Amino acid sequence: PMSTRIAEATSAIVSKHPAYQCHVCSAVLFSPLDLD
Amino acid sequence: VPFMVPISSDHDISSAPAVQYIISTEYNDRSLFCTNSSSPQTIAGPDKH
Ligand SMILES: [Zn+2]
C-alpha cells in the first residue's frame, strides 16, 4: 500500500537523542385546506 | 332575502362558474367597511377602502 511505502520510506530517515375541485389543472381534492 | 356574495381577495386567484338568482336593483352594500383591510390592495372581487 502507498501509505505503507511512504511510512517505510521515511522510517529510514529518522534520528534520535544520543545517550372539492381545481379548475386550473382539473385535479380532484378532498380538503378545503388540501386545495389552498 | 338571501344574497350570495364572493369573498374578496388580496391576490390572483383562479376563477370558476357561479350561478345566481337574486340581485338587488340599487346599491345596498353600504354597510361594507373594508376588504382585505390588512393587505396592500384587493386584486379580485369587491374592492372597498
Ligand atoms: Zn390544480
Q: CA-CA distance, A2 to B49, in Å (whole number)?
A: 78
Q: CA-CA distance, A21 to B40, in Å (whole number)?
A: 29
Q: CA-CA distance, B44 to B36, in Å (whole number)?
A: 10
> Three-state secondary structure along chain A?
CHHHHHHHHHCCCCCCCCCCCCCCCCCCCCCHHHHC
Nearest CA in chain A to B17: A23
Partners of residue B14 in chain A, C-beta under 8 Å: 22-24
CB B42 within 8 A of CB B35: yes
CB B5 within 8 A of CB B17: no
Q: Resolution of the coordinates in A?
A: 3.6
* A24 and chain B in contact, CB less than 8 A: yes
β-partners of residue B9 are: B44
Q: CA-CA distance, B49 to B33, in Å (whole number)?
A: 7
Count Cβ neighbours within 10 Å for each residue of A10-35 and write b for 16 or more, e otherwise.
eeeeeeeeeeeeeeeeeeeeeeeeee
Q: CA-CA distance, B4 to B11, in Å (whole number)?
A: 21
